[PDB]
Amino acid sequence: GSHMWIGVISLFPEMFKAITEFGVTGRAVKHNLLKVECWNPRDFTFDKHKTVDDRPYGGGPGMLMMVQPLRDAIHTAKAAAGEGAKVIYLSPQGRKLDQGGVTELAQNQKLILVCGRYEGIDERLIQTEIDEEWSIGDYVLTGGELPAMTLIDAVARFIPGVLGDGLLDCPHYTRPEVLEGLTVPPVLMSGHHEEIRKWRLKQSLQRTWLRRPELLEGLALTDEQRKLLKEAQAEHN
Amino acid sequence: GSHMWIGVISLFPEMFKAITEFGVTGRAVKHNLLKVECWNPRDFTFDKHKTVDDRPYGGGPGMLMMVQPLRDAIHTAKAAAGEGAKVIYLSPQGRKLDQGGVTELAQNQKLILVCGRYEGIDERLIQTEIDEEWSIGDYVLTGGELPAMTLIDAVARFIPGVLGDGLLDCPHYTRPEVLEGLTVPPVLMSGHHEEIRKWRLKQSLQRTWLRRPELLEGLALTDEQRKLLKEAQAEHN
Ligand SMILES: NC(=O)c1ccc(N[C@@H]2C[C@H](CO)[C@@H](O)C2)nc1
Numbered sequence: 439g440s441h442m443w444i445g446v447i448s449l450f451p452e453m454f455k456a457i458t459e460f461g462v463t464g465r466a467v468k469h470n471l472l473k474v475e476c477w478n479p480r481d482f483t484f485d486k487h488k489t490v491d492d493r494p495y496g497g498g499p500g501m502l503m504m505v506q507p508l509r510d511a512i513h514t515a516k517a518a519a520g521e522g523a524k525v526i527y528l529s530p531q532g533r534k535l536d537q538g539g540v541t542e543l544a545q546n547q548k549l550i551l552v553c554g555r556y557e558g559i560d561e562r563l564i565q566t567e568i569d570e571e572w573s574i575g576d577y578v579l580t581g582g583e584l585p586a587m588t589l590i591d592a593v594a595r596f597i598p599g600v601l602g603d604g605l606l607d608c609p610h611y612t613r614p615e616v617l618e619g620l621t622v623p624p625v626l627m628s629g630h631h632e633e634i635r636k637w638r639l640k641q642s643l644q645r646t647w648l649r650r651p652e653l654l655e656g657l658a659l660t661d662e663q664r665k666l667l668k669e670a671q672a673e674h675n
Numbered sequence: 676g677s678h679m680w681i682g683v684i685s686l687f688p689e690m691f692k693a694i695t696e697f698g699v700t701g702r703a704v705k706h707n708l709l710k711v712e713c714w715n716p717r718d719f720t721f722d723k724h725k726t727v728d729d730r731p732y733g734g735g736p737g738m739l740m741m742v743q744p745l746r747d748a749i750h751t752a753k754a755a756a757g758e759g760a761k762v763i764y765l766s767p768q769g770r771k772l773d774q775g776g777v778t779e780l781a782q783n784q785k786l787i788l789v790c791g792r793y794e795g796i797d798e799r800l801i802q803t804e805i806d807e808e809w810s811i812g813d814y815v816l817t818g819g820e821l822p823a824m825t826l827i828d829a830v831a832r833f834i835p836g837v838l839g840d841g842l843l844d845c846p847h848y849t850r851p852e853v854l855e856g857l858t859v860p861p862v863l864m865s866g867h868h869e870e871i872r873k874w875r876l877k878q879s880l881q882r883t884w885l886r887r888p889e890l891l892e893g894l895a896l897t898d899e900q901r902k903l904l905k906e907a908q909a910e911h912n
Protein backbone atom coordinates (compact mmCIF):
# COMPACT_ATOMS: atom_id res chain seq x y z
CA GLY A 439 0.00 0.00 0.00
CA SER A 440 2.22 2.76 1.33
CA HIS A 441 5.11 0.29 1.02
CA MET A 442 8.72 1.40 1.02
CA TRP A 443 11.74 0.56 -1.11
CA ILE A 444 15.20 1.02 0.33
CA GLY A 445 18.36 0.70 -1.69
CA VAL A 446 21.59 0.05 0.19
CA ILE A 447 25.19 0.47 -0.91
CA SER A 448 27.43 -1.63 1.35
CA LEU A 449 30.60 -3.73 1.39
CA PHE A 450 28.80 -6.07 3.84
CA PRO A 451 25.23 -6.63 2.46
CA GLU A 452 24.81 -9.75 4.61
CA MET A 453 24.71 -7.54 7.72
CA PHE A 454 21.23 -6.48 6.57
CA LYS A 455 19.84 -9.96 7.24
CA ALA A 456 19.66 -8.71 10.82
CA ILE A 457 16.63 -6.64 9.80
CA THR A 458 15.36 -8.53 6.75
CA GLU A 459 15.14 -11.98 8.36
CA PHE A 460 13.98 -11.27 11.94
CA GLY A 461 11.14 -9.80 13.98
CA VAL A 462 8.74 -7.08 12.89
CA THR A 463 11.03 -5.82 10.10
CA GLY A 464 11.55 -9.40 8.91
CA ARG A 465 7.77 -9.78 8.67
CA ALA A 466 7.51 -6.46 6.86
CA VAL A 467 9.96 -7.72 4.24
CA LYS A 468 8.26 -11.11 3.81
CA HIS A 469 4.86 -9.39 3.39
CA ASN A 470 6.32 -6.95 0.80
CA LEU A 471 5.63 -3.85 2.87
CA LEU A 472 9.37 -3.23 2.93
CA LYS A 473 11.91 -4.00 0.26
CA VAL A 474 15.61 -3.69 0.99
CA GLU A 475 17.91 -4.05 -2.01
CA CYS A 476 21.72 -4.11 -1.67
CA TRP A 477 24.56 -3.30 -4.05
CA ASN A 478 28.19 -4.08 -3.11
CA PRO A 479 31.02 -1.84 -4.46
CA ARG A 480 33.18 -4.96 -4.55
CA ASP A 481 31.02 -6.24 -7.42
CA PHE A 482 31.98 -3.09 -9.38
CA THR A 483 35.75 -3.48 -9.20
CA PHE A 484 37.78 -4.64 -12.19
CA ASP A 485 41.18 -5.39 -10.71
CA LYS A 486 42.23 -8.94 -9.82
CA HIS A 487 42.05 -8.33 -6.07
CA LYS A 488 38.72 -6.46 -6.16
CA THR A 489 40.16 -3.40 -4.42
CA VAL A 490 37.54 -1.22 -2.69
CA ASP A 491 39.76 1.15 -0.68
CA ASP A 492 42.19 3.90 -1.76
CA ARG A 493 44.78 6.24 -0.19
CA PRO A 494 43.74 9.67 1.02
CA TYR A 495 45.42 12.70 -0.51
CA GLY A 496 47.43 14.58 2.10
CA GLY A 497 48.46 11.45 3.91
CA GLY A 498 46.79 10.22 7.06
CA PRO A 499 46.37 7.12 9.23
CA GLY A 500 43.75 5.28 7.19
CA MET A 501 42.15 4.60 3.82
CA LEU A 502 39.00 5.84 2.13
CA MET A 503 36.49 3.98 0.03
CA MET A 504 37.74 3.80 -3.54
CA VAL A 505 35.78 6.23 -5.70
CA GLN A 506 35.11 4.22 -8.89
CA PRO A 507 33.51 1.08 -7.43
CA LEU A 508 31.49 3.10 -4.95
CA ARG A 509 30.34 5.65 -7.51
CA ASP A 510 29.37 2.88 -9.95
CA ALA A 511 27.40 1.02 -7.25
CA ILE A 512 25.55 4.23 -6.40
CA HIS A 513 24.67 4.87 -10.06
CA THR A 514 23.35 1.32 -10.41
CA ALA A 515 21.12 1.84 -7.35
CA LYS A 516 19.77 5.19 -8.68
CA ALA A 517 18.88 3.66 -12.06
CA ALA A 518 17.02 0.75 -10.42
CA ALA A 519 15.13 3.12 -8.12
CA GLY A 520 14.03 5.40 -10.91
CA GLU A 521 13.00 8.97 -10.14
CA GLY A 522 12.19 10.31 -6.69
CA ALA A 523 14.82 8.36 -4.76
CA LYS A 524 16.52 10.39 -2.02
CA VAL A 525 20.18 9.40 -1.52
CA ILE A 526 21.38 9.45 2.10
CA TYR A 527 24.92 9.15 3.45
CA LEU A 528 25.23 7.97 7.07
CA SER A 529 27.93 9.73 9.13
CA PRO A 530 28.60 11.63 12.40
CA GLN A 531 28.85 14.83 10.30
CA GLY A 532 25.23 14.50 9.27
CA ARG A 533 22.00 15.89 10.68
CA LYS A 534 21.19 14.25 14.00
CA LEU A 535 18.40 11.71 13.68
CA ASP A 536 15.45 12.07 16.04
CA GLN A 537 11.83 10.95 15.89
CA GLY A 538 10.62 14.00 13.97
CA GLY A 539 13.47 13.33 11.55
CA VAL A 540 12.36 9.69 11.24
CA THR A 541 8.81 10.73 10.31
CA GLU A 542 10.19 13.15 7.72
CA LEU A 543 12.26 10.37 6.14
CA ALA A 544 9.24 8.03 6.28
CA GLN A 545 7.48 10.28 3.71
CA ASN A 546 9.85 9.04 1.02
CA GLN A 547 8.66 6.07 -0.97
CA LYS A 548 12.24 5.40 -2.08
CA LEU A 549 15.54 5.78 -0.21
CA ILE A 550 19.11 4.89 -1.12
CA LEU A 551 21.45 4.50 1.88
CA VAL A 552 25.20 4.76 1.34
CA CYS A 553 27.24 3.02 4.06
CA GLY A 554 30.81 4.24 4.40
CA ARG A 555 33.67 2.04 5.67
CA TYR A 556 37.33 2.79 6.54
CA GLU A 557 37.87 6.54 7.11
CA GLY A 558 34.90 7.53 4.95
CA ILE A 559 34.26 8.54 1.36
CA ASP A 560 35.52 11.25 -1.01
CA GLU A 561 34.01 14.67 -0.27
CA ARG A 562 33.20 15.16 -3.97
CA LEU A 563 30.89 12.11 -4.00
CA ILE A 564 28.99 13.68 -1.14
CA GLN A 565 28.64 16.87 -3.18
CA THR A 566 27.65 15.14 -6.43
CA GLU A 567 25.82 11.99 -5.30
CA ILE A 568 24.34 12.61 -1.84
CA ASP A 569 21.10 14.46 -1.16
CA GLU A 570 21.27 14.43 2.66
CA GLU A 571 23.77 13.48 5.33
CA TRP A 572 22.33 12.02 8.56
CA SER A 573 23.76 10.80 11.87
CA ILE A 574 22.04 8.45 14.30
CA GLY A 575 23.96 10.00 17.20
CA ASP A 576 27.22 11.68 18.26
CA TYR A 577 29.45 8.62 18.31
CA VAL A 578 31.79 6.97 15.81
CA LEU A 579 31.24 3.47 14.42
CA THR A 580 33.30 1.17 12.19
CA GLY A 581 30.78 1.55 9.36
CA GLY A 582 27.49 3.06 8.25
CA GLU A 583 25.62 -0.26 8.10
CA LEU A 584 24.36 -0.21 11.69
CA PRO A 585 23.18 3.40 11.29
CA ALA A 586 21.52 2.48 7.99
CA MET A 587 19.73 -0.47 9.63
CA THR A 588 18.82 1.71 12.56
CA LEU A 589 17.18 4.21 10.17
CA ILE A 590 15.41 1.42 8.23
CA ASP A 591 13.93 -0.08 11.40
CA ALA A 592 12.74 3.33 12.63
CA VAL A 593 11.00 4.33 9.36
CA ALA A 594 9.57 0.84 8.92
CA ARG A 595 7.39 1.42 12.01
CA PHE A 596 5.57 4.14 10.04
CA ILE A 597 4.69 1.90 7.10
CA PRO A 598 1.04 0.85 7.43
CA GLY A 599 0.66 -2.84 8.25
CA VAL A 600 4.08 -3.17 9.84
CA LEU A 601 2.93 -2.59 13.43
CA GLY A 602 -0.34 -3.62 15.07
CA ASP A 603 3.83 12.62 22.01
CA GLY A 604 7.30 13.98 22.79
CA LEU A 605 7.46 12.32 26.22
CA LEU A 606 9.37 9.32 27.59
CA ASP A 607 7.28 6.15 27.91
CA CYS A 608 5.52 5.26 31.18
CA PRO A 609 6.58 2.17 33.18
CA HIS A 610 4.83 -1.08 32.20
CA TYR A 611 4.02 -4.16 34.27
CA THR A 612 3.07 -7.78 33.55
CA ARG A 613 2.85 -11.01 35.60
CA PRO A 614 3.52 -11.73 38.39
CA GLU A 615 1.59 -9.35 40.64
CA VAL A 616 4.50 -9.41 43.14
CA LEU A 617 8.14 -9.62 42.00
CA GLU A 618 10.95 -9.60 44.57
CA GLY A 619 8.63 -7.83 47.01
CA LEU A 620 7.70 -5.25 44.38
CA THR A 621 4.00 -4.90 43.68
CA VAL A 622 2.13 -3.66 40.63
CA PRO A 623 0.56 -0.20 41.14
CA PRO A 624 -3.09 -0.87 42.19
CA VAL A 625 -4.47 1.59 39.59
CA LEU A 626 -3.31 -0.79 36.84
CA MET A 627 -5.40 -3.53 38.51
CA SER A 628 -8.47 -1.30 38.94
CA GLY A 629 -9.98 -1.60 35.47
CA HIS A 630 -10.68 2.14 35.69
CA HIS A 631 -9.54 2.92 32.15
CA GLU A 632 -9.56 6.67 32.75
CA GLU A 633 -7.49 6.61 35.95
CA ILE A 634 -5.06 4.30 34.17
CA ARG A 635 -4.70 6.72 31.26
CA LYS A 636 -4.02 9.59 33.66
CA TRP A 637 -1.57 7.63 35.81
CA ARG A 638 0.40 6.67 32.67
CA LEU A 639 0.48 10.23 31.35
CA LYS A 640 1.50 11.57 34.76
CA GLN A 641 4.28 8.97 34.92
CA SER A 642 5.48 9.95 31.43
CA LEU A 643 5.53 13.63 32.38
CA GLN A 644 7.38 12.93 35.64
CA ARG A 645 9.97 10.64 34.01
CA THR A 646 10.54 13.16 31.22
CA TRP A 647 10.96 15.98 33.76
CA LEU A 648 13.43 14.03 35.94
CA ARG A 649 15.47 12.39 33.15
CA ARG A 650 15.19 14.66 30.14
CA PRO A 651 13.92 18.09 31.29
CA GLU A 652 15.03 19.76 28.05
CA LEU A 653 12.44 17.69 26.18
CA LEU A 654 9.62 19.51 28.04
CA GLU A 655 10.83 22.86 26.73
CA GLY A 656 10.03 21.92 23.14
CA LEU A 657 6.44 21.18 24.08
CA ALA A 658 3.21 23.09 24.44
CA LEU A 659 1.61 21.06 27.23
CA THR A 660 -2.14 20.59 27.35
CA ASP A 661 -3.98 21.85 30.46
CA GLU A 662 -4.26 18.25 31.65
CA GLN A 663 -0.55 17.71 31.09
CA ARG A 664 0.35 20.94 32.93
CA LYS A 665 -1.77 19.82 35.86
CA LEU A 666 -0.40 16.27 36.06
CA LEU A 667 3.19 17.50 35.76
CA LYS A 668 2.66 20.07 38.55
CA GLU A 669 1.12 17.31 40.68
CA ALA A 670 4.14 15.08 39.98
CA GLN A 671 6.54 17.89 40.88
CA ALA A 672 4.67 18.59 44.15
CA GLU A 673 4.80 14.91 45.16
CA HIS A 674 8.50 14.80 44.33
CA ASN A 675 9.33 17.78 46.56
CA GLY B 676 45.06 -7.93 26.42
CA SER B 677 42.46 -5.34 27.34
CA HIS B 678 39.91 -7.61 25.66
CA MET B 679 36.20 -7.27 26.27
CA TRP B 680 33.41 -9.73 27.01
CA ILE B 681 29.86 -8.79 26.15
CA GLY B 682 26.85 -10.83 27.18
CA VAL B 683 23.64 -10.33 25.24
CA ILE B 684 20.07 -11.25 26.13
CA SER B 685 17.99 -11.36 22.94
CA LEU B 686 15.10 -13.17 21.26
CA PHE B 687 17.03 -12.83 17.98
CA PRO B 688 20.71 -13.77 18.72
CA GLU B 689 21.39 -14.36 15.01
CA MET B 690 21.08 -10.61 14.41
CA PHE B 691 24.45 -10.28 16.15
CA LYS B 692 26.22 -12.05 13.26
CA ALA B 693 26.06 -8.61 11.65
CA ILE B 694 28.87 -7.54 13.99
CA THR B 695 30.51 -10.87 14.85
CA GLU B 696 31.06 -12.09 11.28
CA PHE B 697 31.95 -8.92 9.33
CA GLY B 698 34.48 -6.11 9.09
CA VAL B 699 36.60 -4.71 11.91
CA THR B 700 34.32 -6.10 14.65
CA GLY B 701 34.28 -9.48 12.91
CA ARG B 702 38.09 -9.47 12.99
CA ALA B 703 38.04 -8.42 16.64
CA VAL B 704 35.89 -11.45 17.45
CA LYS B 705 38.00 -13.91 15.43
CA HIS B 706 41.19 -12.61 17.12
CA ASN B 707 39.58 -12.93 20.60
CA LEU B 708 39.80 -9.23 21.38
CA LEU B 709 36.01 -9.20 21.59
CA LYS B 710 33.71 -11.94 22.80
CA VAL B 711 29.98 -11.64 22.31
CA GLU B 712 27.89 -14.30 24.05
CA CYS B 713 24.09 -14.55 23.58
CA TRP B 714 21.30 -16.02 25.68
CA ASN B 715 17.75 -16.32 24.29
CA PRO B 716 14.75 -16.06 26.69
CA ARG B 717 12.97 -18.55 24.42
CA ASP B 718 15.42 -21.22 25.64
CA PHE B 719 14.19 -20.54 29.20
CA THR B 720 10.49 -21.14 28.61
CA PHE B 721 8.76 -24.30 29.78
CA ASP B 722 5.40 -24.18 28.04
CA LYS B 723 4.74 -26.13 24.84
CA HIS B 724 4.66 -23.02 22.65
CA LYS B 725 7.74 -21.39 24.21
CA THR B 726 5.86 -18.20 25.10
CA VAL B 727 8.12 -15.15 25.56
CA ASP B 728 5.54 -12.34 25.72
CA ASP B 729 2.85 -11.49 28.31
CA ARG B 730 -0.07 -9.07 28.75
CA PRO B 731 0.49 -5.70 30.39
CA TYR B 732 -1.46 -4.89 33.54
CA GLY B 733 -3.80 -1.97 32.95
CA GLY B 734 -4.55 -2.97 29.40
CA GLY B 735 -2.90 -1.40 26.40
CA PRO B 736 -2.23 -1.95 22.69
CA GLY B 737 0.70 -4.36 22.94
CA MET B 738 2.53 -7.04 24.91
CA LEU B 739 5.59 -7.01 27.13
CA MET B 740 8.41 -9.49 27.41
CA MET B 741 7.36 -12.30 29.72
CA VAL B 742 9.12 -11.93 33.06
CA GLN B 743 10.19 -15.50 33.90
CA PRO B 744 12.07 -16.45 30.73
CA LEU B 745 13.72 -13.04 30.52
CA ARG B 746 14.68 -12.96 34.18
CA ASP B 747 16.09 -16.50 33.97
CA ALA B 748 18.13 -15.63 30.86
CA ILE B 749 19.54 -12.59 32.63
CA HIS B 750 20.52 -14.65 35.71
CA THR B 751 22.27 -17.19 33.49
CA ALA B 752 24.27 -14.40 31.83
CA LYS B 753 25.27 -12.86 35.21
CA ALA B 754 26.51 -16.21 36.53
CA ALA B 755 28.61 -16.85 33.41
CA ALA B 756 30.10 -13.34 33.57
CA GLY B 757 31.06 -13.61 37.21
CA GLU B 758 31.62 -10.47 39.26
CA GLY B 759 32.08 -6.99 37.83
CA ALA B 760 29.61 -7.28 34.96
CA LYS B 761 27.55 -4.13 34.40
CA VAL B 762 24.01 -4.90 33.16
CA ILE B 763 22.64 -2.43 30.60
CA TYR B 764 19.09 -2.10 29.25
CA LEU B 765 18.74 -0.38 25.87
CA SER B 766 15.75 1.98 25.54
CA PRO B 767 14.70 5.54 24.57
CA GLN B 768 14.18 6.24 28.30
CA GLY B 769 17.86 5.71 28.97
CA ARG B 770 20.83 8.05 29.13
CA LYS B 771 21.66 9.38 25.68
CA LEU B 772 24.75 7.73 24.23
CA ASP B 773 27.51 10.00 22.98
CA GLN B 774 31.24 9.54 22.47
CA GLY B 775 32.18 10.44 26.04
CA GLY B 776 29.55 7.91 27.12
CA VAL B 777 31.10 5.31 24.80
CA THR B 778 34.54 5.78 26.38
CA GLU B 779 33.01 5.46 29.84
CA LEU B 780 31.37 2.17 28.87
CA ALA B 781 34.64 0.99 27.26
CA GLN B 782 36.24 0.94 30.75
CA ASN B 783 34.17 -2.12 31.64
CA GLN B 784 35.80 -5.45 30.98
CA LYS B 785 32.39 -7.13 31.11
CA LEU B 786 28.97 -5.93 29.90
CA ILE B 787 25.58 -7.61 29.72
CA LEU B 788 23.16 -6.03 27.22
CA VAL B 789 19.45 -6.68 27.60
CA CYS B 790 17.49 -6.19 24.36
CA GLY B 791 13.78 -5.53 24.81
CA ARG B 792 11.15 -6.49 22.21
CA TYR B 793 7.39 -5.79 21.95
CA GLU B 794 6.38 -2.85 24.19
CA GLY B 795 9.32 -3.35 26.55
CA ILE B 796 10.01 -5.12 29.83
CA ASP B 797 8.55 -5.08 33.35
CA GLU B 798 9.61 -2.01 35.34
CA ARG B 799 10.54 -4.20 38.32
CA LEU B 800 13.19 -6.05 36.29
CA ILE B 801 14.75 -2.71 35.49
CA GLN B 802 14.82 -1.90 39.21
CA THR B 803 16.17 -5.30 40.31
CA GLU B 804 18.30 -6.46 37.37
CA ILE B 805 19.52 -3.40 35.46
CA ASP B 806 22.48 -1.24 36.46
CA GLU B 807 22.12 1.43 33.75
CA GLU B 808 19.62 2.37 31.07
CA TRP B 809 21.06 3.83 27.84
CA SER B 810 19.63 5.17 24.59
CA ILE B 811 21.49 5.48 21.29
CA GLY B 812 19.26 8.38 20.27
CA ASP B 813 15.77 9.91 20.55
CA TYR B 814 13.92 7.56 18.24
CA VAL B 815 11.92 4.37 18.70
CA LEU B 816 12.95 1.01 17.21
CA THR B 817 11.29 -2.41 17.04
CA GLY B 818 13.89 -3.86 19.42
CA GLY B 819 17.03 -3.21 21.44
CA GLU B 820 19.28 -5.40 19.27
CA LEU B 821 20.35 -2.66 16.85
CA PRO B 822 21.11 -0.30 19.76
CA ALA B 823 23.03 -3.09 21.50
CA MET B 824 25.07 -3.76 18.35
CA THR B 825 25.58 -0.05 17.88
CA LEU B 826 27.02 0.17 21.42
CA ILE B 827 29.20 -2.93 20.89
CA ASP B 828 30.69 -1.54 17.66
CA ALA B 829 31.40 1.85 19.29
CA VAL B 830 33.17 0.41 22.38
CA ALA B 831 35.03 -2.15 20.28
CA ARG B 832 36.97 0.71 18.63
CA PHE B 833 38.55 1.41 22.04
CA ILE B 834 39.84 -2.12 22.55
CA PRO B 835 43.56 -2.18 21.76
CA GLY B 836 44.34 -4.12 18.58
CA VAL B 837 40.90 -3.62 17.05
CA LEU B 838 41.79 -0.53 15.01
CA GLY B 839 45.07 0.32 13.29
CA ASP B 840 38.67 16.01 19.76
CA GLY B 841 35.03 17.09 20.01
CA LEU B 842 34.89 18.36 16.41
CA LEU B 843 33.29 17.04 13.23
CA ASP B 844 35.72 15.31 10.86
CA CYS B 845 37.41 17.23 8.01
CA PRO B 846 36.62 16.38 4.36
CA HIS B 847 38.80 13.64 2.82
CA TYR B 848 39.86 13.08 -0.78
CA THR B 849 41.27 10.16 -2.80
CA ARG B 850 41.77 9.41 -6.52
CA PRO B 851 41.05 10.82 -9.02
CA GLU B 852 42.57 14.30 -8.81
CA VAL B 853 39.57 15.69 -10.75
CA LEU B 854 36.04 14.30 -10.29
CA GLU B 855 33.12 15.80 -12.21
CA GLY B 856 35.09 19.05 -12.55
CA LEU B 857 35.84 19.07 -8.83
CA THR B 858 39.50 19.25 -7.90
CA VAL B 859 41.36 18.16 -4.79
CA PRO B 860 42.48 21.11 -2.61
CA PRO B 861 46.12 21.83 -3.64
CA VAL B 862 47.33 21.85 0.00
CA LEU B 863 46.60 18.11 0.18
CA MET B 864 48.92 17.65 -2.83
CA SER B 865 51.68 19.86 -1.40
CA GLY B 866 53.39 17.37 0.90
CA HIS B 867 53.62 20.19 3.44
CA HIS B 868 52.58 18.08 6.42
CA GLU B 869 52.12 21.12 8.67
CA GLU B 870 49.91 23.10 6.28
CA ILE B 871 47.86 19.94 5.76
CA ARG B 872 47.37 19.51 9.51
CA LYS B 873 46.23 23.12 9.84
CA TRP B 874 43.92 23.01 6.81
CA ARG B 875 42.25 19.87 8.23
CA LEU B 876 41.81 21.40 11.68
CA LYS B 877 40.47 24.62 10.19
CA GLN B 878 38.01 22.60 8.10
CA SER B 879 36.88 20.66 11.18
CA LEU B 880 36.34 23.88 13.13
CA GLN B 881 34.43 25.49 10.25
CA ARG B 882 32.22 22.44 9.64
CA THR B 883 31.49 22.13 13.35
CA TRP B 884 30.61 25.84 13.56
CA LEU B 885 28.29 25.75 10.52
CA ARG B 886 26.60 22.39 11.20
CA ARG B 887 26.75 21.85 14.94
CA PRO B 888 27.55 25.20 16.64
CA GLU B 889 26.42 23.93 20.05
CA LEU B 890 29.32 21.46 20.01
CA LEU B 891 31.81 24.38 20.14
CA GLU B 892 30.27 25.63 23.39
CA GLY B 893 31.36 22.51 25.28
CA LEU B 894 34.96 23.09 24.27
CA ALA B 895 37.92 25.06 25.53
CA LEU B 896 39.60 25.83 22.22
CA THR B 897 43.38 26.04 21.98
CA ASP B 898 44.89 29.34 20.79
CA GLU B 899 45.54 27.72 17.42
CA GLN B 900 41.95 26.51 17.23
CA ARG B 901 40.58 29.96 18.19
CA LYS B 902 42.67 31.52 15.45
CA LEU B 903 41.73 29.04 12.71
CA LEU B 904 38.04 29.24 13.62
CA LYS B 905 38.11 33.07 13.52
CA GLU B 906 39.87 32.85 10.14
CA ALA B 907 37.17 30.46 8.90
CA GLN B 908 34.41 32.75 10.14
CA ALA B 909 36.02 35.79 8.44
CA GLU B 910 36.28 33.94 5.11
CA HIS B 911 32.66 32.83 5.43
CA ASN B 912 31.38 36.39 5.94
N1 LIG C 1 26.58 8.15 13.92
C1 LIG C 1 26.46 7.68 12.64
O1 LIG C 1 25.47 7.70 11.93
C2 LIG C 1 27.70 7.11 12.14
C3 LIG C 1 27.84 6.86 10.80
C4 LIG C 1 29.04 6.32 10.40
C5 LIG C 1 30.03 6.07 11.32
N2 LIG C 1 31.22 5.52 10.85
C6 LIG C 1 31.09 5.37 9.42
C7 LIG C 1 32.35 4.74 8.88
C8 LIG C 1 32.97 5.72 7.91
C9 LIG C 1 34.35 6.09 8.38
O2 LIG C 1 34.23 6.75 9.63
C10 LIG C 1 32.10 6.94 7.86
O3 LIG C 1 31.59 7.07 6.54
C11 LIG C 1 30.93 6.73 8.79
N3 LIG C 1 29.89 6.31 12.63
C12 LIG C 1 28.73 6.83 13.01
Ligand SMILES: NC(=O)c1ccc(N[C@@H]2C[C@H](CO)[C@@H](O)C2)nc1
Pocket residue numbers: 765766767790791792793794795796809810811812813814815816817818819822
Ligand atom coordinates in the same frame (compact mmCIF):
# COMPACT_ATOMS: atom_id res chain seq x y z
N1 LIG D 1 17.05 4.46 21.12
C1 LIG D 1 17.28 3.24 21.69
O1 LIG D 1 18.30 2.86 22.25
C2 LIG D 1 16.14 2.34 21.58
C3 LIG D 1 16.10 1.19 22.33
C4 LIG D 1 15.00 0.39 22.17
C5 LIG D 1 14.00 0.76 21.29
N2 LIG D 1 12.90 -0.10 21.18
C6 LIG D 1 13.13 -1.21 22.08
C7 LIG D 1 11.98 -2.18 21.95
C8 LIG D 1 11.30 -2.27 23.29
C9 LIG D 1 9.86 -1.83 23.16
O2 LIG D 1 9.84 -0.47 22.76
C10 LIG D 1 12.02 -1.35 24.24
O3 LIG D 1 12.57 -2.14 25.28
C11 LIG D 1 13.15 -0.70 23.49
N3 LIG D 1 14.04 1.87 20.56
C12 LIG D 1 15.12 2.64 20.72
